[PDB]
Design a protein around this ligand. Structure first.
Ligand code: A5A
Ligand code: ZN
Ligand code: ZN
Length: 739
């Protein structure tokens, strides 16, 4: 069934007065229930029509509309669920939450795990950096926004509800708010993201897309069949209702203010204006008349650049009255007030949710937003600090964060200092480059941002200032952001044994002190001795590989190293190798095993201690292997002071001395997450319907390594070295129960 005929499947549209057309007006197919006319749509010929004339019954406040939407589906069988953080801790393919459906990928959407409820409803804060360049310009784009949704997870033979019920829900909700089906347009478009896709319907009312309804039955797979924005997708066994209603867009359509920004955080926009170099006044009836008429077309000209929006700029300039220049005398400065207002809000969530600024990973996106905000504040000569705007955003929303405003302030203050030094020597650097190249390219502006932290608009300006050939590239930030939106490709990859073997019976999971066992050689490839069951720990998780030997009716075969291949453990032996079928008595070296057990259990205690002392922004930076030393990398915005380090060590040793219990047991994912939160994935996200959960004291992680039985077995913990590997990442080298 093709995407096209996938829409001819929905009996709800035709049975409710909706007829399929194709204007063009965007050139796509769409469904309208209005018999009078079709020229309907969003981007090209419609424009906002609700500005000054709300389209909903009453004007809702952010929190009221949020509650109204959630209760609406709760009284319709949907289970309410709390938002997920904006940092995708539960996965490893993407850094931030780009859609509510992203909370449930890839384990729930693939069936590996069950959804929190079914069907469920939620208001998920999302971050869309790809819209960065249109923020503040179209009147409808934000970087951080809440996508309200109702999801239903269907499996073959078990359907909660599909397309008909989905579209019916959106119409009903809309109608109940004050919009008649005659004014609701459903445009057809494909939707993909996070590894899934499907045909979708965009709900367009008043010239604005307020929600999208996706019938998810496609999943990204190598042998893909469907082509959607570069990726290939095949039809899944499961199918999912994937909807998303923009809370801020609903509120905006309920107030009819000039822009979404004036609808969700007017205080912030006003404050910025009142404390900047804005040439106009937010009370003048004149200015108000200009913005209003311009706001109505924002959706059109906002999606254009160059000679494109250049003409519409004239259209509105005429109708309004004054010249194009006067128009730009307000719109352009406002585009920056709206962006700063928006960006400081996105910072609230990135920082409040645990992101630490850096030049790598998700931290890079945090630093990207902050630098751009610092640059916007500078252009406007903001009389307040970014922090002041963030705190304001915080009290308006009323949300609670893992990271307190206190730490947020500290981070923004340090970023501001780094930015100050960057710009100082950065101006000269670009002035110099202009004398040399006289023509700056897209890749030139890229290198300047990444290698010298120079804001693109700061470099494109100085260049033009010196009469240099250069022009603001399309989605340059989205381009920079896109280059840092997902986890890089780690070439540490798979080993494929020439023969298929039954998954090794790992014996170390249950008993960490089982150094001796009995097994049979069920295969031998090169140096890879393979048994049916073994206590030997393969080089993985956080601890290094075991070392020992296999005894049998043949002598003693020393195992020097141990890897693994898709479940089969490999015992590396050279020269005198066992005969496939021999029965052996494996003996693991006690010292090597205990050393790793202590240090690995210490890693947990240390991680727990680091968070308690430094703050909830502390998260394991990663374990990019090299086990020469016992090390732990974490996200922290500066070097720990000597007293903090002293305090980290002290707290860990009090935990060890307390000799708390260390436990482990296989647990279903949903059960684990519900009980321990996403702090469960600090060391990575493992696959499986059931994950091994380890509890070292009060720290809880999905871990597959061998640990001590109680924290007292770790021995004293001594921090031997604290180093700043890279901005936002600090390395702790330590010893546990030894030198
Ligand atoms: C359901 C599908 N996964 C999806 O995400 N559809 S969507 O990309 O269109 O997003 C759903 C809704 O969130 C809101 N939204 C999307 N991006 C936005 C942005 N950058 N700023 C403000 N609102 C946005 C709009 O109402 C949009 O219709
Ligand atoms: Zn350089
Ligand atoms: Zn562990």
């Amino acid at each position: 069934m093709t995407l096209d005929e996938e829409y001819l499947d929905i009996t709800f549209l035709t049975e409710n007065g909706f007829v399929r057309k194709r204007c063009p007006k965007c050139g796509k197919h769409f469904w309208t229930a209005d018999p009078e006319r079709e020229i309907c749509g969003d981007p090209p010929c419609e424009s906002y029509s609700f500005i000054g004339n709300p389209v909903f019954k009453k004007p809702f406040e952010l929190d009221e509309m949020r509650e109204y939407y959630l209760n609406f589906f709760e009284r319709r069988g949907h289970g309410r669920i709390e938002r997920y953080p904006v940092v995708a801790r539960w996965r490893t393919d993407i850094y931030l939450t780009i859609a509510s459906i992203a909370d449930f990928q890839p384990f729930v959407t693939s069936g590996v795990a069950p959804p929190p409820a079914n069907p469920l409803t939620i208001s998920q804060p999302c971050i869309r950096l790809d819209d960065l360049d249109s923020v503040g310009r179209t009147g409808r784009h934000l970087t951080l926004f809440e996508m309200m949704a109702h999801h239903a997870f269907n499996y073959p033979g078990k359907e909660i509800y599909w397309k008909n019920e989905t579209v019916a829900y959106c119409t009903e909700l809309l109608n109940e708010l004050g919009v008649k089906k005659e004014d609701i347009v459903y445009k057809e478009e494909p939707w993909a993201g996070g590894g899934n896709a499907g045909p979708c319907l965009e709900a367009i009312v008043g010239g604005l897309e307020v929600a999208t309804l996706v019938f998810m039955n496609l999943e990204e797979h190598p042998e893909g069949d469907i082509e959607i924005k570069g990726a290939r997708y095949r039809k899944m066994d499961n199918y999912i209702v994937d909807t998303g209603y923009g809370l801020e867009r609903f509120v905006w359509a309920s107030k009819g203010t000039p822009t979404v920004y004036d609808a969700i955080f007017p205080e912030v926009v006003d404050t910025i204006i009142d404390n900047s170099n804005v040439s106009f006044n937010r009370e003048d009836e004149r200015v108000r008349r200009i913005v209003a008429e311009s706001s109505k077309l924002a959706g059109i000209m906002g999606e254009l650049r160059g000679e494109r929006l250049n003409q519409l700029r004239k259209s509105v300039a005429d109708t309004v009255g004054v010249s194009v220049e006067e128009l730009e005398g307000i719109v352009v400065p406002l585009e920056k007030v709206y962006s700063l207002a928006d960006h400081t809000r996105c910072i609230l969530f990135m920082l409040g949710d645990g992101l630490v600024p850096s030049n790598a990973g998700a931290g890079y996106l945090a630093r990207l937003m902050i630098r751009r905000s610092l640059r916007l504040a500078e252009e406007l000569e903001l009389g307040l600090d970014l922090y002041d705007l963030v705190e304001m955003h915080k009290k308006i929303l009323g949300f609670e964060f893992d990271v307190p405003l206190s730490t947020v302030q500290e981070i923004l203050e340090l970023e501001k200092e780094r930015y100050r030094t960057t710009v100082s020597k950065g101006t000269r650097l670009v002035e110099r480059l202009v004398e040399r190249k006289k023509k700056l390219e897209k890749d030139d502006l890229i290198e300047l941002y990444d290698s010298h932290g120079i804001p693109v608009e700061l470099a494109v300006g100085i260049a033009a200032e010196k009469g240099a050939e250069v022009e603001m590239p399309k989605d340059i930030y989205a381009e920079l952001a896109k280059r840092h939106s997902k986890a890089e490709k780690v070439q540490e990859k798979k080993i494929t044994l020439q023969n298929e073997y039954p998954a090794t019976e790992k014996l170390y999971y249950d008993d960490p002190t089982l150094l001796e066992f009995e097994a049979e050689v069920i295969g031998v490839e090169g140096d890879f001795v393979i048994l049916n069951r073994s206590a030997f720990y393969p080089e993985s998780g956080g601890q290094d590989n075991d070392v020992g030997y296999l005894i049998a009716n043949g002598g003693k075969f020393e195992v020097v190293d141990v890897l693994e291949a898709d479940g089969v453990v490999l015992h590396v032996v050279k020269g005198a190798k066992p005969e496939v079928g021999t029965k052996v008595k494996g003996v693991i070296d006690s010292d090597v095993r205990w050393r790793h057990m202590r240090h690995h259990s210490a890693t947990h205690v240390l991680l727990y201690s680091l968070q308690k002392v430094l703050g909830n922004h502390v998260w394991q930076a990663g374990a990019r292997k090299e086990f020469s030393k016992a090390r732990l990398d974490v996200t922290h915005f500066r070097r720990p002071s000597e007293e903090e380090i002293k305090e980290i060590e002290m707290l860990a040793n009090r935990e060890i001395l307390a000799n708390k219990p260390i436990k482990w047991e296989w647990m279903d994912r949903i059960e684990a997450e519900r009980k321990f939160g996403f702090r469960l994935y600090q060391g990575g996200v493992p696959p499986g319907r059931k994950i091994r959960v380890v509890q070292v004291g009060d720290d809880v992680q999905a871990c597959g390594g061998t640990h001590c039985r109680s924290t007292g077995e770790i021995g004293m913990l001594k921090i031997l070295k604290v180093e700043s590997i890279q901005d936002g990442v600090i390395r702790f080298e330590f010893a546990a129960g030894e030198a």
